[PDB]
């Protein structure tokens, strides 16, 4: 299991919390090979992890955090308050 944690507390908090559980099957051969095989598994996993942890969040969080609340509305126009207070919808 592979857990990250980051915490920022200036002007309010932000936290990164994470983990990856991995189950793998390896075959023993030599001391030089088993030393360089497990490390290789860790190296690729932790890079793929950091890669996903960095590259998915910079883009996908921006879009999923946006799917919850969008940066501008569905019109892409700042909502008009005068319009809201003197318009009717429906049938």
């Amino acid at each position: 299991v592979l857990k990250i944690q980051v915490h920022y507390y200036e002007d309010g908090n932000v936290q990164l919390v994470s983990h990856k559980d991995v189950q793998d099957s390896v075959t023993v051969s030599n001391e030089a090979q088993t030393a360089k095989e497990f490390i290789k598994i860790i190296e690729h996993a932790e890079n793929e992890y950091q890669t996903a942890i960095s590259e998915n969040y910079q883009t996908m969080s921006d879009t999923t955090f946006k799917a919850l609340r969008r940066q501008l509305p569905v019109t892409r126009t700042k909502i008009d308050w005068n319009k809201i207070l003197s318009y009717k919808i429906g049938k």
């Binding site: 569905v74 019109t75 892409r76 126009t77 005068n82 318009y87």
Partner: protein, 370 residues
């Protein structure tokens, strides 16, 4: 003073008029001012010397016709004042401009000076109690009953695609061209000269429009029709002489899809419809593709919708459900929605009153429209 308001749906080719809450515009006539070419020697002649509506349609040959409107933008303001005065006069409506509030229409992304000068005419020359200007795409959706969807339109002046989502007309995704029915009729006239039969006079121009209305179809594959040889179908003029039209009938409405023919690098109808959907947001695209509404007279060509479907299939992303709906009364779709908008009680809030115009001016008209 809250009388039954008048809905004047302005158009470059045809102008529609009538009262609020009706099923159809009772008063539809072409938007031009015919004036006599020849000299009047004999007494008991046609009096006035300024012809609008059915008199002008009856006596085309006498009148040097000239359109005040071009691409949804009035050039001749004195002529539009005479048309609006004729609309309210006893020959059509039989009412006063002083009593009823006015619903007006215009194309999107037009000159703001023309919108101000329109308001000046309705408030000062006519004595209107309250005015309101609106879009064509918003009204067409009110007529159908829907809220969401794209509205492709093709009148005589403008072709513009406006995407709307749940009663929110998206301003930044409004696509527009100055290629439309009048330009197709002008392109047909130029093609008929290449065939043989020329129509140079302004009264004689409406024969080309009548040929365009009747005998023009949009072929699905243009390259296949170009390789094949046409049949040369006939058409009888108002005189009686025959005209073998030939390949000009099918190459004429190609202008709307291929604007490179007239000599004007524009997008075209099908590209405008795709561009309007693409400029709008990712979440709304699939709903906008499913709800595509057609209106205007230049959508009434044979196999227009079938060609517009094929062009969307070519451009748009694959495996998406396309649906180009079209009402029965496409010519009057914009007026029906205005009549519905006028009949609703909320119309009182939206309009610009005469008192509010006198206090503020043009700024209040710009605020209330958007």
């Amino acid at each position: 003073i809250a009388n039954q308001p008048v809905v004047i749906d302005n158009g470059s080719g045809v102008i529609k008029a009538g009262f609020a809450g009706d099923q159809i515009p009772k008063y539809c006539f072409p938007n031009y001012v015919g004036r006599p070419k020849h000299v009047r020697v004999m007494a008991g002649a046609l009096e006035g010397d300024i012809f609008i509506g059915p008199k002008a349609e009856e006596h085309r040959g006498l009148l040097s016709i000239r359109y005040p409107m071009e691409h949804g933008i009035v050039k001749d303001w004195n002529d539009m004042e005479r048309i609006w005065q004729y609309v309210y006069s006893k020959e059509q409506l039989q009412t006063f401009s002083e009593e009823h509030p006015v619903l007006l229409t215009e194309a999107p992304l037009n000159p703001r000076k023309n919108r101000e000068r329109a308001a000046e005419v309705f408030f000062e020359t006519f004595n209107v109690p309250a005015l309101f200007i609106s879009m064509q795409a918003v009204l067409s959706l009110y007529a159908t009953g829907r809220t969401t969807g794209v509205v492709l339109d093709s009148g005589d002046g403008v072709t513009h695609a406006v995407p709307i989502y749940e009663g929110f007309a998206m301003p930044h995704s409004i696509m527009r061209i100055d290629i439309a029915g009048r330009d197709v009729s002008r392109f047909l006239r130029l093609y008929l000269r290449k065939e043989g039969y020329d129509f140079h006079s302004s009264s004689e121009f409406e024969i080309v429009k009548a040929i365009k209305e009747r005998a023009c179809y949009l072929s699905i594959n243009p390259q296949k029709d170009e390789t094949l040889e046409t049949e040369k179908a006939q058409y009888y003029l108002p005189d009686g002489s025959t005209i073998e039209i030939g390949p000009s009938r099918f190459r004429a409405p190609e202008l709307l899809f291929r604007p490179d023919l007239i000599g004007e690098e524009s997008e075209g109808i099908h590209e405008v419809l795709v561009f309007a959907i693409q400029k709008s947001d990712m979440d709304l695209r699939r709903t906008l593709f499913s709800n595509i509404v057609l209106s205007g007279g230049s959508t009434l060509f044979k196999g227009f919708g079938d060609r517009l479907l094929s062009e969307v299939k070519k451009l748009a992303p694959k495996d998406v459900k396309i649906r180009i709906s079209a009402p029965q009364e496409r010519l009057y779709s914009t007026w029906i929605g205005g009549s519905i908008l006028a009949s609703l009680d909320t119309f009182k809030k939206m309009w610009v009153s005469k008192k509010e115009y006198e206090e503020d001016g043009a700024r209040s008209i710009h605020r209330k429209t958007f």
